[PDB]
Amino acid sequence: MFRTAVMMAASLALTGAVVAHAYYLKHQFYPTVVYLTKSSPSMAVLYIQAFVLVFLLGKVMGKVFFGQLRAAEMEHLLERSWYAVTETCLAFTVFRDDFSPRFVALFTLLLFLKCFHWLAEDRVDFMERSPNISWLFHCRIVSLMFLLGILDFLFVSHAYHSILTRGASVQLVFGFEYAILMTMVLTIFIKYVLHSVDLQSENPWDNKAVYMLYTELFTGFIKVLLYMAFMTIMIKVHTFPLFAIRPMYLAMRQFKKAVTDAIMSR
Amino acid sequence: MFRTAVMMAASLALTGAVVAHAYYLKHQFYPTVVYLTKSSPSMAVLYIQAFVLVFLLGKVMGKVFFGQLRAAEMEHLLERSWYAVTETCLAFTVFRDDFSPRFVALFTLLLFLKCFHWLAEDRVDFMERSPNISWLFHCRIVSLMFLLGILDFLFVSHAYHSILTRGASVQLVFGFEYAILMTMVLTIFIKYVLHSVDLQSENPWDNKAVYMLYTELFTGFIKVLLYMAFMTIMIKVHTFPLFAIRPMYLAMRQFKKAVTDAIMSR
Amino acid sequence: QMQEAEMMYQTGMKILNGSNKKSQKREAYRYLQKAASMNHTKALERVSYALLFGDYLPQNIQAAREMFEKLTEEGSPKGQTALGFLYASGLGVNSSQAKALVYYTFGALGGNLIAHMVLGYRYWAGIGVLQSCESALTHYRLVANHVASDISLTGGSVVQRIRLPDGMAYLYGRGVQVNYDLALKYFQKAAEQGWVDGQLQLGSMYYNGIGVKRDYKQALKYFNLASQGGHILAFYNLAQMHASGTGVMRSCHTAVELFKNVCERGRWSERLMTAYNSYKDGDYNAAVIQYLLLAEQGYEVAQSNAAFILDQREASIVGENETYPRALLHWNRAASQGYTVARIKLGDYHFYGFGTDVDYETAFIHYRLASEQQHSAQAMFNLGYMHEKGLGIKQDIHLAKRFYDMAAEASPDAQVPVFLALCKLGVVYFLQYIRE
Amino acid sequence: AKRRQMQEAEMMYQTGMKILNGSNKKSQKREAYRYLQKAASMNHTKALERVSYALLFGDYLPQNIQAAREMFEKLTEEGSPKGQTALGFLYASGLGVNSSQAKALVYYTFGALGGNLIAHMVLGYRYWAGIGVLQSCESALTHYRLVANHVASDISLTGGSVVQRIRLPDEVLYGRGVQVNYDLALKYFQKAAEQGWVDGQLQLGSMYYNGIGVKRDYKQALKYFNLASQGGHILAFYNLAQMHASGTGVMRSCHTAVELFKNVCERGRWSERLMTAYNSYKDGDYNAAVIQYLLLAEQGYEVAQSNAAFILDQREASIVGENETYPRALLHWNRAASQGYTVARIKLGDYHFYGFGTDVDYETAFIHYRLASEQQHSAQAMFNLGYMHEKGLGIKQDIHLAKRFYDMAAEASPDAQVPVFLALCKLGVVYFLQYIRE
Amino acid sequence: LSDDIPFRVNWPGTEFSLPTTGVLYKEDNYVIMTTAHKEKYKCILPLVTSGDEEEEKDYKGPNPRELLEPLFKQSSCSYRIESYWTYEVCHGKHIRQYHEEKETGQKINIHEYYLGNMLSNEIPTKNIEGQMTPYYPVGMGNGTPCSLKQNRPRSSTVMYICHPESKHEILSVAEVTTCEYEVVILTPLLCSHPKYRFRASPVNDIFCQSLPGSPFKPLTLRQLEQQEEIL
Amino acid sequence: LSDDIPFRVNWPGTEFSLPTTGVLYKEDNYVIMTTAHKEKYKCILPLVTSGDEEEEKDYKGPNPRELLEPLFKQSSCSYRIESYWTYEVCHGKHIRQYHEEKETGQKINIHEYYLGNMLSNEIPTKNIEGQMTPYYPVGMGNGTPCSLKQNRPRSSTVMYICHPESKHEILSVAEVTTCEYEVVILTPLLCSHPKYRFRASPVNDIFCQSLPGSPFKPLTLRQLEQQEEILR
Numbered sequence A, B: 001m002f003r004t005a006v007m008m009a010a011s012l013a014l015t016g017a018v019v020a021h022a023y024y025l026k027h028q029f030y031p032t033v034v035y036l037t038k039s040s041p042s043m044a045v046l047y048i049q050a051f052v053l054v055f056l057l058g059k060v061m062g063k064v065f066f067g068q069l070r071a072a073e074m075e076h077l078l079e080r081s082w083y084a085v086t087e088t089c090l091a092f093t094v095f096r097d098d099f100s101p102r103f104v105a106l107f108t109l110l111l112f113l114k115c116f117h118w119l120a121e122d123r124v125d126f127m128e129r130s131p132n133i134s135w136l137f138h139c140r141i142v143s144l145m146f147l148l149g150i151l152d153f154l155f156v157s158h159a160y161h162s163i164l165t166r167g168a169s170v171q172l173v174f175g176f177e178y179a180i181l182m183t184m185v186l187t188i189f190i191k192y193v194l195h196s197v198d199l200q201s202e203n204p205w206d207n208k209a210v211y212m213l214y215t216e217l218f219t220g221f222i223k224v225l226l227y228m229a230f231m232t233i234m235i236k237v238h239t240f241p242l243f244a245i246r247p248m249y250l251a252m253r254q255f256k257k258a259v260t261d262a263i264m265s266r
Numbered sequence C: 001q002m003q004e005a006e007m008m009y010q011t012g013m014k015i016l017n018g019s020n021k022k023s024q025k026r027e028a029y030r031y032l033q034k035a036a037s038m039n040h041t042k043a044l045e046r047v048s049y050a051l052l053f054g055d056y057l058p059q060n061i062q063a064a065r066e067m068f069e070k071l072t073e074e075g076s077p078k079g080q081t082a083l084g085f086l087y088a089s090g091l092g093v094n095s096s097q098a099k100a101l102v103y104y105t106f107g108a109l110g111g112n113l114i115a116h117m118v119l120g121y122r123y124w125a126g127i128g129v130l131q132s133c134e135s136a137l138t139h140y141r142l143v144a145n146h147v148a149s150d151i152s153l154t155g156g157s158v159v160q161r162i163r164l165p166d167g168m169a170y171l172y173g174r175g176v177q178v179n180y181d182l183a184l185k186y187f188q189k190a191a192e193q194g195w196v197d198g199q200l201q202l203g204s205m206y207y208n209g210i211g212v213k214r215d216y217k218q219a220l221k222y223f224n225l226a227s228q229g230g231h232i233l234a235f236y237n238l239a240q241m242h243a244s245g246t247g248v249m250r251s252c253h254t255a256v257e258l259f260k261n262v263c264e265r266g267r268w269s270e271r272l273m274t275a276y277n278s279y280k281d282g283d284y285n286a287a288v289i290q291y292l293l294l295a296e297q298g299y300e301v302a303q304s305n306a307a308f309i310l311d312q313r314e315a316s317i318v319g320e321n322e323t324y325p326r327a328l329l330h331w332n333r334a335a336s337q338g339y340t341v342a343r344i345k346l347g348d349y350h351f352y353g354f355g356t357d358v359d360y361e362t363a364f365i366h367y368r369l370a371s372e373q374q375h376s377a378q379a380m381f382n383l384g385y386m387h388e389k390g391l392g393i394k395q396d397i398h399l400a401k402r403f404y405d406m407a408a409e410a411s412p413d414a415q416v417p418v419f420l421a422l423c424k425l426g427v428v429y430f431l432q433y434i435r436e
Numbered sequence D: 001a002k003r004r005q006m007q008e009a010e011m012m013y014q015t016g017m018k019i020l021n022g023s024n025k026k027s028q029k030r031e032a033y034r035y036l037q038k039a040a041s042m043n044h045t046k047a048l049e050r051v052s053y054a055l056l057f058g059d060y061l062p063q064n065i066q067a068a069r070e071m072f073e074k075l076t077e078e079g080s081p082k083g084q085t086a087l088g089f090l091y092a093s094g095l096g097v098n099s100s101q102a103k104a105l106v107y108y109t110f111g112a113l114g115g116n117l118i119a120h121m122v123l124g125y126r127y128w129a130g131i132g133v134l135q136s137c138e139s140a141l142t143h144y145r146l147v148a149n150h151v152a153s154d155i156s157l158t159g160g161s162v163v164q165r166i167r168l169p170d171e172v173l174y175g176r177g178v179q180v181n182y183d184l185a186l187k188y189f190q191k192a193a194e195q196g197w198v199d200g201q202l203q204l205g206s207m208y209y210n211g212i213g214v215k216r217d218y219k220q221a222l223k224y225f226n227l228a229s230q231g232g233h234i235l236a237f238y239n240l241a242q243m244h245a246s247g248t249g250v251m252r253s254c255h256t257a258v259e260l261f262k263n264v265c266e267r268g269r270w271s272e273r274l275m276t277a278y279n280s281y282k283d284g285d286y287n288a289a290v291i292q293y294l295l296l297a298e299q300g301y302e303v304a305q306s307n308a309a310f311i312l313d314q315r316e317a318s319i320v321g322e323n324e325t326y327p328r329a330l331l332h333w334n335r336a337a338s339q340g341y342t343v344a345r346i347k348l349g350d351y352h353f354y355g356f357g358t359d360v361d362y363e364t365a366f367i368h369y370r371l372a373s374e375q376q377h378s379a380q381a382m383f384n385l386g387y388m389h390e391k392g393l394g395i396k397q398d399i400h401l402a403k404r405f406y407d408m409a410a411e412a413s414p415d416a417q418v419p420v421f422l423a424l425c426k427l428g429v430v431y432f433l434q435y436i437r438e
Numbered sequence E: 001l002s003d004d005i006p007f008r009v010n011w012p013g014t015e016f017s018l019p020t021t022g023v024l025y026k027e028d029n030y031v032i033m034t035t036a037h038k039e040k041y042k043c044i045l046p047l048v049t050s051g052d053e054e055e056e057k058d059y060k061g062p063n064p065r066e067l068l069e070p071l072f073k074q075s076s077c078s079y080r081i082e083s084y085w086t087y088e089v090c091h092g093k094h095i096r097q098y099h100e101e102k103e104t105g106q107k108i109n110i111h112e113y114y115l116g117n118m119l120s121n122e123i124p125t126k127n128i129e130g131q132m133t134p135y136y137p138v139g140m141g142n143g144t145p146c147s148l149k150q151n152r153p154r155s156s157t158v159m160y161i162c163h164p165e166s167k168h169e170i171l172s173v174a175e176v177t178t179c180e181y182e183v184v185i186l187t188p189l190l191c192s193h194p195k196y197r198f199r200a201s202p203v204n205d206i207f208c209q210s211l212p213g214s215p216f217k218p219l220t221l222r223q224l225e226q227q228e229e230i231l
Numbered sequence F: 001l002s003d004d005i006p007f008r009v010n011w012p013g014t015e016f017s018l019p020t021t022g023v024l025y026k027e028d029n030y031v032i033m034t035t036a037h038k039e040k041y042k043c044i045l046p047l048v049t050s051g052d053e054e055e056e057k058d059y060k061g062p063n064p065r066e067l068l069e070p071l072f073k074q075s076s077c078s079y080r081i082e083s084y085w086t087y088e089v090c091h092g093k094h095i096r097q098y099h100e101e102k103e104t105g106q107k108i109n110i111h112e113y114y115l116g117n118m119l120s121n122e123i124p125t126k127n128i129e130g131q132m133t134p135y136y137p138v139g140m141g142n143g144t145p146c147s148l149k150q151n152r153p154r155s156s157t158v159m160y161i162c163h164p165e166s167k168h169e170i171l172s173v174a175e176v177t178t179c180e181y182e183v184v185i186l187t188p189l190l191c192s193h194p195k196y197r198f199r200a201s202p203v204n205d206i207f208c209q210s211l212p213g214s215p216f217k218p219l220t221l222r223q224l225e226q227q228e229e230i231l232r
């Protein structure tokens, strides 16, 4: 990780130069932090710095809660990221929320969280074909399944009463991705429980796994039908979003992966 | 032509109605005429009564001074008027002298004299080959030649006095054409004299052809001198003429048809 | 029973303020007249100031006068003003200037403002009272303060002065009004070049996309609102220095016409447009009446327009034998305010004996006062004609010939008639010399 | 022969005066002023004062203070009203001459008696804000009315060419309907211009290059509207002050009389030297961008008293000595404080906090930050008040009032959220650690 | 309709008797009146004729000749600036007109002309500005010859009109024929004789009576009177 | 140097003897002054000391409590409106801090806090607005408890500074610590007392002697004196 510390130290000496440049003009505390806020170049390095810190934070998170990558999911981590990071900016370039140092984080934490829900599900599909998993693997991923589940949910609860007690604003979209992150933990909720009975039984279960996939296919359809009832609210008010059609498009794909799969089994 | 007397009766009726239309609205002499000066349907009508009136005036004078048109000079007048009417129309817009209904009557005199000057040229070549000419034909031509000489002399005296007192204006180029108009009346005067001495003697004169050739060389040299002077005085002041090049080529041809013909003959 | 009177008037007040349609205005006026049946004063004056004027109700001069008697019996402040105008201009009642003056002064004591306007002007141009500084000045101040307070808030609605025949008095100070004028004219030059799409070449004008030039002209109108508003504050403030003591010394005769150029703009001069509009669809009985209030009030536009309407004998209130004297009166009033065409029209009125006897001397001096002060080529040529035929004064020629000469250079469009006149003058001169 | 020398002097001066009025070129100005110097060689007074107000102000000549004073003494002995004024300015600001306020006062009073107008404005403000003399209505009212009358009698004719009050420490009841119709017309023009056919990114390629044809006359319309509106506004202010001073309508009032005569005089025609001093601040000549600001500060501008205190603050002026540069900036900060400037009160508190010029005194800076806070609601005053509250600077230390000050600093502006965030985090961290240690 | 007859309203109280001399005041012409504040009034107007000349014009003063005699001796004259010419009027010596021709640099040409030299029960009345106003005519000639009268020296009449704000200035310039002119002079002294005074119409006075129970004059223009006295 | 020391121009004329009391006058600090109308003046300047306090401070009047007991017994006291609160101070009875909550239609809630109740050769001096002025305090405590200091009753000090045109109002309100307050009073009475008067700096007079051949008053100043007296 010598190159990783190289990127951090060079960037720290870059943010160390900007906060020294701003200090030399305005010698006092409060005008320094004000001048770093308003001037477009000093804000971009801090934008660049914070992306580096979360990059190291994600890898440290990926180190602790994931022992070793199977070298077949990082591209699956990559494409769903630039789906989500394009999703957030498109909503931001629609809603006229403007560049402010209070909501640019919230889209990036939205980009942060959504990746690990993808990293949850790829780890549980590998669990479906894992014949040697210890109790330390099983008992520690359920904590990650639970802990970021509630922290997303309580921040959704922080948001949905902010939108209710103020009016229709940019916080309306925020809880809606939080809502499908809310289903995202309820996705790995059912998948752990159905995994729990497969490991303890030394025999395949035919209708049990079929009903397990049938239940997960059901709520995964209901979760998207609330989310389509989310988006369709926004034609009458504000403006045509021209975004969130990409996971509109996969949403009904998951439904057709559910309705036709149930019809063939029935 | 009865149709010529028909359109002229219809012409006076058209101007007869507009003034009465103007007199009904504005009851006094002064404000009924300025409406004719400024308003577009009134003023556009009144000069083409004046155009056909000066056409009728030129015709009724032509019958007094000429017994009958030979039906050969009618076509010669037709094109020669048609080029000059475009040369006069182009000179009025290039000089940026604006629409003033007191100068429109001024060049209408110029084209009326220039048309009657060409009638003297087309009557003196026929007189060269006229074996039966009465004394009335000679008297009605020497009256036309004398009358055109003084009026050309009177108009340059107005022009070269105007160019010294007022300054460089549109009056300068009109007196230069009138000076050129003196040049073509000087040619017939020699041609009439050389042909009057031909008819009084019952024998051909060999010196008459040499005298006619030498005088055409003389008037050819003074025609190209007047053209090359008008070029030089019009590039220094005002703007590019871009006119009077059509009869410059005819004057250059007349110089070529006289000097080079005398060089081949002598 | 009084409770239902005001309630019906409230419906008309709501409909009139809430709707500008013709049928809605007619219904609101009918409701106002129904409220005016039981002598409701506010609606009575509101139906009065439209029933006599026209363009809202059919015109009934006698009913207006017969209810103006009760309106002035109660002591209504706008009841005195209009009935004093009725007695002044001779409208359906024998004229008397003293009664008109007392009714006007009591309307000005009722707190009205058109009465204050009329008293300031009739004090200013010596009509029915001695010419005076002080009371013309205070009557114009009591209106210009209110007009200034209104244009400071509401923005000062712009009204186009249209003519129907269409000291420190040089500019009454300079500076701020001049700069407002060049700001106006440079914004005017800005908008006109913007519409120009002759260099479109498949674009630019967006294929009849009118949605640019519409708000161009509305931005232009709103800029005109702002510029005339600031102009009127400028004139009011220069006038308030010129009146009391400051900047320039005490100067009555160059303050009351600066105040008058604020009071005239005001809000009362919206009756100019609804009189001009009434003229453009027949209804010659309605423009000659709305213009008479603005003529007695003091406008120079309306004194001319009312004289021009009376000149062609379409005004139906006045007798056909008494149309010209009132037209002569309004022409004479428009002459004193510096209008050019009024002076020549006064000259013609004395020339043909219009209303008065034929008397050429007053005609000649009227044509002259039009000549040397306003430089009108029309009066130059007309007094030259007056010279050349020897009416009024002695006959000779060279005075006419020079008058025709400066008639020629004075205006560019006077080229033709001076030529046809000196042509006939030379013809007469040569015929007399031949006879000699 | 002495009369012939006087005859040649006016002959020399008239050529320079004609060249100056006829040409705006810097070389032409320098040549005309060299003619003025040769005129001043034979002691020509109109040329003496015309070169005296450029040898000291450094705008058309190389600046040289000592020659300017050496001829200012001759101009005062002769009795000029434009020589006693600037000699009073020199004796007031201590500019190349030892300082004394009494000599400045007597020179300013005689320059007012000579009929000068800068001395009238100076004595009016110094009687208004109580500098050097006793505070009073009457003397400030007289010496401001005598300037307001002249500037209106100048603007009612000439229109009073505009000037914009630019601030060095920032950049580096009449007229509602006109204003609302004017911005409404502006926004309709701007939406119409942005409608167009995409007036920016058109079909383009190599661009049509037909010509915009809209910008310069639009700026001309705005500029002449600005000049016209400021003209009308100070016309209205003059009339309001006259009617508040004489007693008509509203009785005699002193305070809003002088505050309007003051705004009338300030918007006058000697405010082009605001631009002359600012333009002398660019191109790096501070020695003449602090003298054309010191005069405008003595006259009583709050823009000039702040620009000349900002210029004296960063140690750039090389005329005033290094051991007298901060008191001469403290004085102008103090003067720009009492005229209602937010930054002036904060910087006065900073001066009393760091011991600039005066001795270090935390309790005195406390009152200055308090006055910057409660009067004008300036965020940085709340934040610095919280910082003094936090570690007991000048008063007893307390946490909860410091927190109160930080939250209303956060509410006071939409700009101050970040530093109050990291202040409240550091405050809670120190409190938690101290409670842990207990 | 007789614009130039004035009027003035006054408030002489409750008890008042109509005057007999001057104008006649009748009783049928009264009008009942009220303002906004419930005050009843009665205004009476007289007949608006102001005819005849029964002003008892008695003048023991001498003829109009000696009043202008001090203007002869003083020889202090004013001038007049016109569009091109400059009419200089001096009283008792001659009238002069000239126009300066400023040549470039050294000399000034002068075009000096000469109007003339000076070496009845019904008074004459002339029309200026449309109003009838008396005048005293004088006659003189022997000026420069004019070629359009075939070498006849010019003559002109000099006009006298009074104005209290006048300083012997020229109002206008006129001529009736070629080389015969008329010059109008505004002198301030001669109007003091009653027959040469400016013909101002007498003010016709309308009196409004105050019916008791009301102030002698309406309560509104009291404060309006106090309003102008403080401005 | 500063902007505190006041000067006043005087024109006594030709004869003048330099005063030996107060400020000091010395004969080198003279300026010769010529106006525009060629009138010659001799202006003398005072020495800028304004030192010491030898104003003969001898007062035989009563104690400062005498000037305050009527203000206590009048029982008519002042108010003050803030952005949120309303501080009502009543001299001699208590100080009240409260805010009215206007519920929509029927209820009006009051958030009341109690600031207290009343059941030396050098005068201490408080720096208000950057000027030193000597005061008289009123020590006071036993307010309502403050939860920040475990239900300690509030304490406050009442501050007295004169102002000759006053209506017993409050200039400013300060909180030095939590639940300990400071309030000031502008009253027109208590600087009949010798020491709590506004310390006006003495006016150093400037005299301008008139030399012979010149009047004692300059001509342009002479007509400037009549214009504003008429315009007054």
Ligand SMILES: *[C@@H]1O[C@H](CO)[C@@H](O[C@@H]2O[C@H](CO)[C@@H](O[C@H]3O[C@H](CO[C@H]4O[C@H](CO[C@H]5O[C@H](CO)[C@@H](O)[C@H](O)[C@@H]5O)[C@@H](O)[C@H](O[C@H]5O[C@H](CO)[C@@H](O)[C@H](O)[C@@H]5O)[C@@H]4O)[C@@H](O[C@H]4O[C@H](CO)[C@@H](O)[C@H](O)[C@@H]4O)[C@H](O)[C@@H]3O)[C@H](O)[C@H]2NC(C)=O)[C@H](O)[C@H]1NC(C)=O
Pocket: D400, D403, D404, D407, F083, F084, F097, F113, F146, F148, F178, F179
């Ligand atoms: C324009 O004008 C508007 C007015 O209409 C302004 O409106 C603001 O409105 C909001 C409403 O949400 C107000 O917010 C809060 O208001 C009340 C009252 O809180 C104030 O009072 C607190 C009292 O605490 C102190 O009281 C004593 C004072 O002598 C002390 O001795 C005592 O020790 C104690 O410290 C005060 O502390 C508080 O300031 C801050 O202090 C706390 C603690 O340090 C901080 O944590 C906070 O951040 C707080 O801001 C306030 O000044 C409050 O309601 C109270 O009472 C109800 C009763 O049921 C309780 O339920 C509730 O819990 C609380 O106890 C609320 O908390 C409310 O949010 C705000 O004060 C108004 N602002 C102003 C300036 O008036 C609007 O802001 C104006 N716009 C501008 C200026 O731009």
Ligand SMILES: *[C@@H]1O[C@H](CO)[C@@H](O)[C@H](O)[C@H]1NC(C)=O
Pocket: C037, C038, C039, C070
């Ligand atoms: C008032 O209204 C009644 C309606 O009945 C009418 O009879 C009466 O004449 C009115 N008053 C006047 C003065 O006309």
Ligand SMILES: *[C@@H]1O[C@H](CO)[C@@H](O)[C@H](O)[C@H]1NC(C)=O
Pocket: C092, C093, C094
């Ligand atoms: C007006 O008065 C005249 C005379 O006084 C009279 O003849 C006429 O009838 C009156 N007209 C009206 C409508 O009263």
Ligand SMILES: *[C@@H]1O[C@H](CO)[C@@H](O)[C@H](O)[C@H]1NC(C)=O
Pocket: C320, C321, C322
């Ligand atoms: C107008 O009134 C008088 C009265 O005789 C007269 O001129 C004429 O008869 C009247 N007009 C008409 C048209 O009868």
Ligand SMILES: *[C@@H]1O[C@H](CO)[C@@H](O)[C@H](O)[C@H]1NC(C)=O
Pocket: D041, D042, D043, D074
């Ligand atoms: C005034 O002019 C004279 C003439 O040369 C000169 O000697 C003198 O120095 C001048 N005055 C000053 C103060 O320089």
Ligand SMILES: *[C@@H]1O[C@H](CO)[C@@H](O)[C@H](O)[C@H]1NC(C)=O
Pocket: D098, D099
């Ligand atoms: C100016 O003051 C300084 C300060 O002591 C002194 O040295 C100098 O002599 C003074 N100059 C004059 C001309 O008084």
Ligand SMILES: *[C@@H]1O[C@H](CO)[C@@H](O)[C@H](O)[C@H]1NC(C)=O
Pocket: D322, D323
């Ligand atoms: C300012 O004061 C210091 C303090 O001793 C002293 O050096 C000198 O008087 C001044 N400083 C300089 C650098 O001249």
